[PDB]
């Protein structure tokens, strides 16, 4: 149990010539053999077309090396935004258990279109193959009236793989809404199913992440753009809300809850949720958001009155992400790739591993 924590390891410091914000949107993955993989949006000068770098750690995140790049082999655009890594926990069609997936959005350098893709690695991240196209959208700017798709998140439920994402395609009715599609083979995707939408046109629920709880329930966490009560001097904000459901295909008609910590802190922006068995029968739900450095925890299965907040040494970052370690539930990785543009040339990809038993004190 000794020597497993470490603070602010620098995974990747981009060159001066990368385009603002240079890097962003870090995502980690623990494989069944204990190795870690990571990726981020890599804003290299183009051409050549942008790619998702894949880094590997064998020592629990202390040291890293690049072992491959996921490249767009289909569109001659690049893999540009919102990567997401995922290890299959069971076979889906011809992809066995242990296959690594990388989802993300392929987008031309002019940002005229958006395309959520799935790539797969059969060798724990050394090589990649295109698998399928998921969702095509329009222009890659987060403005009302445009029709892009964004921000894929993968999770298995029973025999289905669910891919949740953000959707502006219903542009006459919702500025953006949250949706999913499912697959049983990674080839054929189900029709679009709504997960969260709001009647007010200018509402923009976005950036969905999901975690399984030990009471047969799932928690769906998102940033509710256009949510009520923007703070003084703000006409529009992105408070973190969530929903609870037994069936993670049916969040749509579940009551929303805002996350507010015991002291009144209101996380906002680009959230990320995990659950670990640490801390009791209920374990611990841990959420990060994009505007605070603290983590927010809940040891009461998502009871709205039970959120707490704790400092960690990893700085605030856009869609700062979290990872739990299968063989040690007390250990939490927090990974970030800096802030939204303008970043001032100072974003780097970094991570910390903390113990909840130390940090929750
Ligand atoms: O990831 C790069 C980033 O994506 C764009 O924003 C997407 C919006 N984020 C919250 C909403 O869910 C979505 O519409 C932004 O232009 C890029 O910097
Ligand atoms: Ca740099």
């Amino acid at each position: 149990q000794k020597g497993k924590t470490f603070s602010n390891v620098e995974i990747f410091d981009p060159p001066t010539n990368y385009r603002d914000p240079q890097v962003l949107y870090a995502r980690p993955l623990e494989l069944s053999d204990g190795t870690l993989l990571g990726t981020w949006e890599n804003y290299s000068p183009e051409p050549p077309n942008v790619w998702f770098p894949i880094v590997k750690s064998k020592d629990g995140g202390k040291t890293w090396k690049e072992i491959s790049k996921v490249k767009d082999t289909q569109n001659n655009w690049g893999l540009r935004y919102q990567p997401q890594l995922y290890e299959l926990p069971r076979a889906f069609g011809k992809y066995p258990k242990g296959t690594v997936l990388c989802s993300g959005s392929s987008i031309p350098s002019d940002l005229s279109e958006t395309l959520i893709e799935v790539y797969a690695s059969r060798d724990k991240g050394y090589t990649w193959e295109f698998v399928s196209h998921v969702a095509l959208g329009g222009e890659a700017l987060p403005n009302p009236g445009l029709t892009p798709v964004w921000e894929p998140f993968l999770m298995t439920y029973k025999e289905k793989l669910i891919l949740y994402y953000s959707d502006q395609r219903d542009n006459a009715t919702h500025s953006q809404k949250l949706v999913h599609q499912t697959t049983t083979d990674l080839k054929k995707w189900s029709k679009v199913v709504d997960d969260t939408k709001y009647a007010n046109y200018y509402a923009r629920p976005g950036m969905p992440t999901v975690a399984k709880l030990p009471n047969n329930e799932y928690i769906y966490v998102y940033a509710y753009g256009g949510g009520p009560n923007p703070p003084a001097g703000s006409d529009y904000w992105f408070p973190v809300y969530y929903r609870l459901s037994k069936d993670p295909q049916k969040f749509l008609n579940k009551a929303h809850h805002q996350i507010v910590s015991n002291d009144g802190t209101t996380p906002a922006g680009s959230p990320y949720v995990v659950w670990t068995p640490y801390g009791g029968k209920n374990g611990t739900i841990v959420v990060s958001c994009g505007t605070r450095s603290e983590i927010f925890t809940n040891q009461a299965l998502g009871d709205a009155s039970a959120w707490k907040k704790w400092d960690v040494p990893q700085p605030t970052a856009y869609t700062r992400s979290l990872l739990t370690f299968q063989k040690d539930p007390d250990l939490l990785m927090i990974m970030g790739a800096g802030i939204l543009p303008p970043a001032g040339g100072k974003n780097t990809v970094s991570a910390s591993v903390v113990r909840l038993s130390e940090v929750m004190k």
Side-chain angles (χ1 to χ4, degrees), residues 21 24-25 41 43 81-82 140-142 150-151 166 168 176 204-207 238 318 340-341:
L24 198 76
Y25 210 111
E41 297 170 354
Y43 289 71
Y81 282 173
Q82 297 133 24
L141 302 168
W150 320 94
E151 290 145 358
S166 305
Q168 296 193 221
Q176 186 175 269
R204 295 175 63 76
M207 318 192 71
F238 301 86
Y318 182 70
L340 280 163

Side-chain angles (χ1 to χ4, degrees), residues 75-286:
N75 307 314
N76 200 11
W77 291 346
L79 294 177
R80 188 172 310 276
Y81 282 173
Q82 297 133 24
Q84 180 66 44
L85 293 163
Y86 184 72
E87 186 193 48
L88 300 187
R90 68 185 288 164
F92 295 94
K94 60 155 147 146
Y95 303 96
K97 177 175 162 159
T99 302
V100 175
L101 296 187
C102 190
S103 191
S105 188
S106 186
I107 303 166
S109 54
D110 72 5
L111 306 183
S112 55
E113 300 187 71
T114 43
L115 184 43
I116 299 167
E117 311 280 60
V118 174
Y119 277 70
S121 169
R122 300 176 180 270
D123 55 10
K124 311 197 204 220
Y126 288 99
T127 60
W128 303 87
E129 72 190 290
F130 172 77
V131 176
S132 69
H133 297 305
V134 190
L136 179 69
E139 190 177 2
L141 302 168
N143 299 345
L146 297 188
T147 62
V149 291
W150 320 94
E151 290 145 358
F153 185 83
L154 287 166
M155 192 189 68
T156 291
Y157 177 64
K158 302 306 180 184
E159 83 290 351
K160 302 182 187 172
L161 181 65
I162 306 173
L163 196 160
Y164 301 90
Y165 60 98
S166 305
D167 190 1
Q168 296 193 221
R169 282 170 310 186
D170 200 1
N171 66 332
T173 315
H174 304 275
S175 190
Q176 186 175 269
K177 57 174 189 182
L178 291 169
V179 308
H180 77 257
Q181 292 167 260
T182 71
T183 189
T184 64
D185 62 4
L186 275 166
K187 293 301 188 168
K188 189 216 221 213
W189 293 93
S190 77
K191 51 40 258 185
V192 178
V193 178
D194 291 347
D195 292 322
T196 277
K197 62 178 173 46
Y198 283 93
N200 183 311
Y201 176 84
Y202 293 103
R204 295 175 63 76
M207 318 192 71
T209 61
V210 185
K212 181 178 158 67
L213 307 179
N215 64 341
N216 193 31
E217 285 213 281
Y218 290 82
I219 185 177
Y220 180 85
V221 172
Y222 57 100
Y224 174 6
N229 279 298
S234 162
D235 86 297
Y236 197 93
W237 73 322
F238 301 86
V240 180
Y241 275 67
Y242 63 100
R243 290 172 195 208
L244 304 168
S245 182
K246 286 151 174 258
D247 184 337
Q249 298 166 102
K250 299 182 168 312
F251 290 112
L252 181 66
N253 291 135
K254 308 296 196 293
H256 68 186
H257 305 276
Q258 179 181 12
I259 297 190
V260 190
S261 71
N262 53 298
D263 83 341
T265 296
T266 56
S270 67
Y272 201 99
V273 68
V274 291
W275 174 86
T276 168
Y278 171 84
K281 168 178 181 166
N282 296 348
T284 304
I285 302 174
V286 187

Side-chain angles (χ1 to χ4, degrees), residues 12-16 22 345-348:
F12 176 67
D13 184 354
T16 303
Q22 304 197 310
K346 289 183 216 310
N347 286 359
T348 66

